[PDB]
Amino acid sequence: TVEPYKVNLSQDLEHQLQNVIQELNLEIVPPPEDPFLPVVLNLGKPSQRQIGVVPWSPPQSNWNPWTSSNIDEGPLAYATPEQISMDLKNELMYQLEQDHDLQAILQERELLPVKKFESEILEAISQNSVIIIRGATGCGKTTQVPQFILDDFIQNDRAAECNIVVTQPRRISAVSVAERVAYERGEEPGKSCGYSVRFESVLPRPHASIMFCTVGVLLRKLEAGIRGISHVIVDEIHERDINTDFLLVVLRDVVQAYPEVRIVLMSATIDTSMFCEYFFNCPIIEVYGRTYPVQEYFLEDCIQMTHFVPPPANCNLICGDEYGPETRMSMAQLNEKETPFELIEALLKYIETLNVPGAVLVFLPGWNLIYTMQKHLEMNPHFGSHRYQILPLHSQIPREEQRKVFDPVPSGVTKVILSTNIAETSITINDVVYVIDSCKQKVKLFTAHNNMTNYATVWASKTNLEQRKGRAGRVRPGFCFHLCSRARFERLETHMTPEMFRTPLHEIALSIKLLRLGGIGQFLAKAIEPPPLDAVIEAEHTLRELDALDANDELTPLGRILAKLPIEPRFGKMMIMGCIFYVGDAVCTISAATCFPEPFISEGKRLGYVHRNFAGNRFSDHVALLSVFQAWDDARMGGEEAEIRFCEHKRLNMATLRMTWEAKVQLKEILINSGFPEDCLLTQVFTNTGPDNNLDVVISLLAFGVYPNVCYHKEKRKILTTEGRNALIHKSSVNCPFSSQDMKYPSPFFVFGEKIRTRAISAKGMTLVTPLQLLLFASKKVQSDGQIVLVDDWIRLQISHEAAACITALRAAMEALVVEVTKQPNIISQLDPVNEHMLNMIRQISRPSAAGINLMI
Ligand SMILES: Nc1ncnc2c1ncn2[C@@H]1O[C@H](COP(=O)(O)OP(=O)(O)O)[C@@H](O)[C@H]1O
Ligand SMILES: CS(=O)(=O)Nc1cccc(NC(=O)c2cc(-c3ccccc3)cs2)c1
Ligand SMILES: [Mg+2]
């Protein structure tokens, strides 16, 4: 157990709290008659009910479908479709006529398996409202089909009547495919091709254009409707991305009401009968090309071929008699929960002895096991520049480094790709003869009850291993090396659990309400495979708690704002609260930074003197974050090269800071348009060492945003979670003790970003908060016996009943103000003296000094 923490609160402040509560006429819960029966201090403190179909209209010559606005300037404002159609045709005919590098690219395009199905695909699309283009990965579904459709309208003098939307499940795919199709038309993105992912877009031209966006972005732009679009291409439907599954529900209603629209669903070689039945038994256009017979090998075959020996229910124990005693004895020593890196090294050295030039595609879960495998290889001098080109391929690296996987290598060098499941069905790498398959997947499991994020390394499906096996037989007779026992393969599920089954639904719930599609549960019931009940109940509960929905489950003015903001609704509300306190910029910066990896280059180690200094004396990763932005935004003043020098010298990832800043500008814009004043979102300079009340309030609002992630510090890295369970301070934290010197925290309480479950519970991105900040924002339920208070039945404080119930009343007073503010956001300019008195009182108890703490000593 742990003793109740004493909160040394001054007599002056305890009166001020009581005064404000009295001035606001707040119904404070009085003390208990006796101990043993404690009282809850929590103060509990609508629109008419409505199904609806998202409206549709075809392309128009004086309309820009991407900016969702009229063209009332330039030549295209008055110009007729016939002129635009001829102007765009003549331009393309002349380009193909001249550019010899473009002619060569078109000659590569015309060799892709999909090419010979061009006639049938175009014929199918023209006849039917919806079709499915099923076909193996590498035929050219993604890159060619949109072009075929566009060219067919250009060549047949109807370029003005074509505007294609193409949805991709991943961010990287939307941007990469746009860059790829642009190159294939001898352009950069911004002409015939463009992309619109989250916090980054390059808009294409208003006519005869393709938009490669993510589904999340499309849904956020449907508020007006699908106006000025001829075709909607939903790509990679087989991956079962939750937002894609959701869009198919929307699009089916759209097809039914507006059958003139054209929907093209594109899928790998899977059972597409589910989607066919869903879209009124639509046609399935089959696409195929040359494939070679790939030899399948499992963990037994690999260990035996390489004569491998590991260092110092389990399916590695189960092994057939048709194998060797040492093979069976060797395999048995391998832990299934880890990937054998030394075996992959042994498999690469075996691939050499076969004397058949070809690239090796190594499938791994995430950026960690790719980083680990890469580091492991470069240690051995054999896997050097002269003999091996080892290229990593995951989401969070520059596109320059990702483009290099397609580049040919000089003969004598082997191209080894250490990739995630991006290279499973989403992209095809050429000259791939060998595939080393870990047989694992990285999925984000989230259990709401304990607020546990688990980036788990779970088993892949049979369908996954069959698709990964097929990545070898596109050049010549290939080999696939599965690192799973022949027993384990039998125990694998046929298909991966679709995201709809195992993902929070509150972001989708808001989308449903914004687009006015009716009831959350009513709409999600129409899904191709509806989500489980508790996930819909959990979503409806989450949005009610935030006052995003009311008792009638109808969207509130607050809920409308949260829907438009593309971040966690809890961070969206934290930003709204931030605006009220005139710290809107800082909270927008913090909110943005959650969407990107850490700007620090720590390399999975403890932080150095340089990175730790950004934290100041606040014992906060979030203060460190805000501080690198202050330092970075100051360094940018001296041009681009000075920015690159600052980043290199301070070991910072420049691409991360730029994308995060860009995101902050876009979040800020959505608040401005929602009615919030300009001068409550200004970049206010701050100190991370000296007294700063604006930073005090940011950390108070942080506590709200990351709730229910709070923890208690015991000794060294060992911390106590909200479940009363043991957890660790993450190595990458500033609050992680460097070497043996134990940190003297002025408070044991920490709010934090993610509650990562691995071997043990690891709290990442930690910020120290006072016990007053704990009671104000980082708690829901509070019970008092008169002397002790019980915060969410996990930790106890020794604080005056009066102060604890008053701090609990401010929380309710703030919620009430947030509701009033969201009805008319411009009221934060001039507030009632009474409202500013409770804001000033929150500002007061946000201070360290308020809890008798001086961070400078
Ligand atoms: N960035 C790229 N660099 C080189 N080749 C590429 C690139 N993107 C796609 N390709 C090639 O284009 C062809 C079609 O790919 P794609 O349209 O993604 O196929 P799919 O039908 O599987 O979606 C493949 O041969 C692939 O190797
Ligand atoms: C609604 S639709 O489905 O018919 N068309 C559609 C589809 C997908 C995406 C977008 N639009 C965008 O992605 C973006 C637009 C702007 C923008 C807007 C105004 C001024 C300046 C920039 C930035 S991103 C439209
Ligand atoms: Mg594809």
Short mmCIF file of C-alpha atoms in Angstrom, two decimals, residues 530-781:
data_model
loop_
_atom_site.label_atom_id
_atom_site.label_comp_id
_atom_site.label_asym_id
_atom_site.label_seq_id
_atom_site.Cartn_x
_atom_site.Cartn_y
_atom_site.Cartn_z
CA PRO A 530 -21.03 -4.13 -37.83
CA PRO A 531 -18.91 -3.34 -34.72
CA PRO A 532 -19.51 -5.08 -31.34
CA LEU A 533 -22.22 -3.52 -29.07
CA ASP A 534 -19.88 -2.41 -26.18
CA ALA A 535 -17.70 -0.40 -28.69
CA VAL A 536 -20.84 1.63 -29.75
CA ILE A 537 -21.88 1.98 -26.02
CA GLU A 538 -18.27 3.05 -25.11
CA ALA A 539 -18.27 5.62 -28.00
CA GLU A 540 -21.74 7.03 -26.99
CA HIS A 541 -20.53 7.21 -23.30
CA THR A 542 -17.21 8.96 -24.30
CA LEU A 543 -19.07 11.71 -26.30
CA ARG A 544 -21.76 12.19 -23.55
CA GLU A 545 -18.95 12.67 -20.91
CA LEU A 546 -17.34 15.38 -23.17
CA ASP A 547 -20.81 17.04 -23.71
CA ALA A 548 -20.22 16.40 -27.48
CA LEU A 549 -23.69 14.70 -27.44
CA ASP A 550 -26.69 15.63 -25.18
CA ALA A 551 -29.36 13.32 -23.56
CA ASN A 552 -31.08 13.10 -27.04
CA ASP A 553 -27.67 11.85 -28.46
CA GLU A 554 -27.82 14.94 -30.80
CA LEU A 555 -24.65 16.95 -31.71
CA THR A 556 -23.96 19.98 -29.39
CA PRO A 557 -22.16 23.18 -30.56
CA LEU A 558 -19.08 21.77 -28.67
CA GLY A 559 -19.50 18.36 -30.44
CA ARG A 560 -19.69 20.18 -33.84
CA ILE A 561 -16.25 21.84 -33.15
CA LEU A 562 -14.68 18.49 -31.98
CA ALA A 563 -15.94 16.81 -35.24
CA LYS A 564 -14.24 19.49 -37.46
CA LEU A 565 -10.93 19.18 -35.46
CA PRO A 566 -8.97 16.13 -36.79
CA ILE A 567 -7.55 15.05 -33.33
CA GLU A 568 -8.83 13.02 -30.30
CA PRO A 569 -12.07 14.75 -29.11
CA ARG A 570 -10.51 15.04 -25.57
CA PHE A 571 -7.54 17.05 -27.04
CA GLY A 572 -10.09 19.02 -29.15
CA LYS A 573 -11.85 20.06 -25.88
CA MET A 574 -8.39 20.73 -24.26
CA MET A 575 -7.71 23.17 -27.19
CA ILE A 576 -11.15 24.89 -26.63
CA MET A 577 -10.29 25.26 -22.88
CA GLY A 578 -6.78 26.51 -23.91
CA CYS A 579 -8.42 29.29 -26.04
CA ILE A 580 -10.47 30.45 -22.95
CA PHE A 581 -7.20 30.84 -20.88
CA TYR A 582 -5.44 32.58 -23.88
CA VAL A 583 -2.85 29.73 -24.22
CA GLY A 584 -4.51 28.35 -27.43
CA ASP A 585 -1.20 28.22 -29.40
CA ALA A 586 0.67 26.05 -26.79
CA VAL A 587 -2.25 23.51 -26.46
CA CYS A 588 -2.57 23.43 -30.33
CA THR A 589 1.25 22.68 -30.51
CA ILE A 590 0.89 19.81 -27.92
CA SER A 591 -2.27 18.45 -29.72
CA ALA A 592 -0.48 18.54 -33.14
CA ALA A 593 2.69 16.76 -31.83
CA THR A 594 0.58 13.65 -30.85
CA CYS A 595 -0.10 13.03 -34.63
CA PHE A 596 3.69 12.70 -35.41
CA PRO A 597 6.66 10.79 -33.90
CA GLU A 598 8.84 12.50 -31.19
CA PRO A 599 10.93 15.39 -32.67
CA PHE A 600 13.95 14.16 -30.55
CA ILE A 601 16.41 11.63 -32.14
CA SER A 602 17.04 9.52 -28.95
CA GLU A 603 17.60 6.17 -30.84
CA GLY A 604 15.67 4.21 -28.12
CA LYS A 605 18.24 5.33 -25.45
CA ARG A 606 18.05 7.67 -22.37
CA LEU A 607 18.04 11.42 -23.33
CA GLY A 608 21.36 13.39 -23.28
CA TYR A 609 22.21 16.77 -21.60
CA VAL A 610 21.05 18.71 -24.75
CA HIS A 611 17.53 17.09 -24.93
CA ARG A 612 17.02 17.11 -21.09
CA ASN A 613 17.81 20.91 -20.94
CA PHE A 614 14.67 21.66 -23.10
CA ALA A 615 12.57 20.26 -20.16
CA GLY A 616 13.82 23.06 -17.82
CA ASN A 617 12.94 22.30 -14.14
CA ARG A 618 9.26 21.32 -14.86
CA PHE A 619 10.06 17.52 -15.01
CA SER A 620 7.88 17.53 -18.21
CA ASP A 621 8.37 16.01 -21.72
CA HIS A 622 5.51 18.36 -22.88
CA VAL A 623 7.50 21.46 -21.67
CA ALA A 624 10.58 19.98 -23.49
CA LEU A 625 8.33 19.67 -26.62
CA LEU A 626 7.05 23.33 -26.41
CA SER A 627 10.69 24.49 -25.72
CA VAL A 628 12.27 22.82 -28.85
CA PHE A 629 9.51 24.60 -30.93
CA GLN A 630 10.37 27.99 -29.28
CA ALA A 631 14.12 27.29 -29.96
CA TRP A 632 13.42 25.88 -33.52
CA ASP A 633 11.01 28.73 -34.58
CA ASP A 634 13.75 31.20 -33.39
CA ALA A 635 16.47 29.32 -35.43
CA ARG A 636 14.28 29.45 -38.64
CA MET A 637 14.59 33.32 -38.56
CA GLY A 638 18.06 32.88 -40.22
CA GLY A 639 16.87 31.02 -43.37
CA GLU A 640 16.67 27.28 -44.29
CA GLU A 641 20.35 26.18 -43.82
CA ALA A 642 20.45 27.69 -40.25
CA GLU A 643 17.29 25.60 -39.44
CA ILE A 644 19.05 22.39 -40.74
CA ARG A 645 22.22 23.29 -38.68
CA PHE A 646 20.16 23.90 -35.45
CA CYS A 647 18.35 20.51 -35.97
CA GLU A 648 21.60 18.53 -36.73
CA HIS A 649 23.51 20.22 -33.80
CA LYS A 650 20.60 19.57 -31.31
CA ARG A 651 19.84 16.01 -32.70
CA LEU A 652 16.28 17.03 -33.86
CA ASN A 653 14.20 15.57 -36.79
CA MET A 654 13.47 18.76 -38.85
CA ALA A 655 10.77 17.01 -41.03
CA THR A 656 8.77 16.25 -37.79
CA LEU A 657 8.90 19.86 -36.40
CA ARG A 658 7.84 21.32 -39.83
CA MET A 659 4.86 18.88 -40.25
CA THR A 660 3.82 19.52 -36.56
CA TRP A 661 3.98 23.36 -37.01
CA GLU A 662 2.00 22.99 -40.30
CA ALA A 663 -0.59 20.88 -38.33
CA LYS A 664 -0.75 23.54 -35.51
CA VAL A 665 -1.56 26.26 -38.17
CA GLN A 666 -4.45 24.06 -39.54
CA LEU A 667 -5.87 23.25 -36.03
CA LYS A 668 -5.66 27.02 -35.19
CA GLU A 669 -7.50 27.85 -38.51
CA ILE A 670 -10.47 25.49 -37.66
CA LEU A 671 -10.88 27.27 -34.24
CA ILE A 672 -10.76 30.75 -35.96
CA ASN A 673 -13.48 29.66 -38.51
CA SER A 674 -15.50 28.15 -35.57
CA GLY A 675 -15.61 31.76 -34.20
CA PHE A 676 -12.68 31.86 -31.67
CA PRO A 677 -10.73 35.18 -31.56
CA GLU A 678 -7.30 35.63 -33.31
CA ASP A 679 -5.57 37.04 -30.16
CA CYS A 680 -6.32 33.91 -27.97
CA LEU A 681 -4.12 31.71 -30.31
CA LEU A 682 -0.93 33.93 -30.49
CA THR A 683 2.58 32.36 -30.10
CA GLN A 684 3.34 33.61 -26.52
CA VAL A 685 7.07 33.36 -25.50
CA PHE A 686 7.60 31.46 -22.18
CA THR A 687 10.35 30.40 -19.68
CA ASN A 688 10.71 26.69 -18.63
CA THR A 689 12.82 27.57 -15.48
CA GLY A 690 11.41 30.85 -14.00
CA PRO A 691 7.78 31.58 -12.93
CA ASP A 692 5.38 31.36 -15.97
CA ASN A 693 1.57 31.25 -15.29
CA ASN A 694 0.75 30.60 -19.02
CA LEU A 695 2.87 27.36 -18.86
CA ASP A 696 1.23 26.51 -15.44
CA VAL A 697 -2.26 26.61 -17.14
CA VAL A 698 -1.05 24.56 -20.21
CA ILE A 699 0.10 21.69 -17.86
CA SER A 700 -3.30 21.94 -16.02
CA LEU A 701 -5.06 21.55 -19.44
CA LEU A 702 -2.57 18.73 -20.38
CA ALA A 703 -3.78 16.78 -17.26
CA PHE A 704 -7.38 17.03 -18.68
CA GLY A 705 -6.35 15.94 -22.24
CA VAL A 706 -4.34 12.78 -21.31
CA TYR A 707 -6.79 11.63 -18.52
CA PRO A 708 -7.20 8.95 -17.36
CA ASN A 709 -3.35 8.58 -17.74
CA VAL A 710 -2.14 9.67 -14.24
CA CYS A 711 0.42 7.74 -12.06
CA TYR A 712 2.20 7.89 -8.62
CA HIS A 713 6.06 7.63 -8.27
CA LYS A 714 7.49 5.21 -5.61
CA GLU A 715 11.27 4.67 -6.30
CA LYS A 716 13.55 5.00 -9.42
CA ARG A 717 11.51 4.08 -12.61
CA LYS A 718 8.77 2.10 -10.71
CA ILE A 719 5.40 4.03 -10.77
CA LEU A 720 1.79 3.11 -9.69
CA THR A 721 -1.02 3.21 -12.36
CA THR A 722 -4.80 3.96 -11.82
CA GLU A 723 -5.45 0.15 -11.41
CA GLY A 724 -2.96 0.00 -8.45
CA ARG A 725 -0.54 -1.97 -10.74
CA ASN A 726 3.29 -1.54 -11.13
CA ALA A 727 4.58 0.38 -14.23
CA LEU A 728 7.93 1.87 -15.49
CA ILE A 729 9.03 5.42 -16.54
CA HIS A 730 9.88 5.06 -20.30
CA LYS A 731 13.67 5.31 -21.12
CA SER A 732 12.97 8.16 -23.66
CA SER A 733 11.43 10.39 -20.88
CA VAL A 734 13.36 13.36 -19.32
CA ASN A 735 11.91 12.13 -15.94
CA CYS A 736 13.75 8.76 -16.48
CA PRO A 737 16.76 8.83 -14.10
CA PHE A 738 20.09 9.00 -16.06
CA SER A 739 22.40 6.35 -14.43
CA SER A 740 22.18 5.81 -10.58
CA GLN A 741 21.28 9.42 -9.45
CA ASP A 742 17.60 9.08 -8.28
CA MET A 743 15.49 12.19 -9.17
CA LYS A 744 14.06 14.31 -6.26
CA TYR A 745 10.58 15.11 -7.74
CA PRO A 746 8.78 17.96 -5.85
CA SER A 747 5.54 15.92 -6.52
CA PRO A 748 5.10 12.12 -7.02
CA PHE A 749 2.11 12.67 -9.44
CA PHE A 750 2.60 12.49 -13.27
CA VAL A 751 0.09 12.71 -16.18
CA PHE A 752 1.45 11.12 -19.44
CA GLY A 753 0.70 10.54 -23.17
CA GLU A 754 0.45 6.75 -23.89
CA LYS A 755 0.04 3.82 -21.39
CA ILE A 756 2.16 1.32 -23.47
CA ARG A 757 1.77 -2.40 -22.44
CA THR A 758 4.82 -4.55 -23.53
CA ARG A 759 6.60 -6.90 -21.01
CA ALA A 760 5.59 -4.40 -18.25
CA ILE A 761 3.44 -1.18 -18.28
CA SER A 762 5.59 1.77 -19.59
CA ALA A 763 4.32 5.41 -19.15
CA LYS A 764 5.72 7.47 -22.12
CA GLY A 765 5.75 11.32 -22.42
CA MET A 766 5.40 12.20 -18.69
CA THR A 767 4.60 15.64 -17.11
CA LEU A 768 4.79 16.35 -13.32
CA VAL A 769 1.53 17.88 -11.89
CA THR A 770 0.70 19.15 -8.33
CA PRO A 771 -1.98 17.36 -6.22
CA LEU A 772 -4.24 20.45 -6.84
CA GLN A 773 -3.90 19.87 -10.66
CA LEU A 774 -4.67 16.14 -9.93
CA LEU A 775 -8.01 17.06 -8.20
CA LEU A 776 -8.95 19.79 -10.80
CA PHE A 777 -8.50 17.97 -14.19
CA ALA A 778 -6.73 14.54 -13.67
CA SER A 779 -9.66 12.87 -11.75
CA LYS A 780 -13.41 12.00 -12.14
CA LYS A 781 -14.62 10.43 -8.80
#
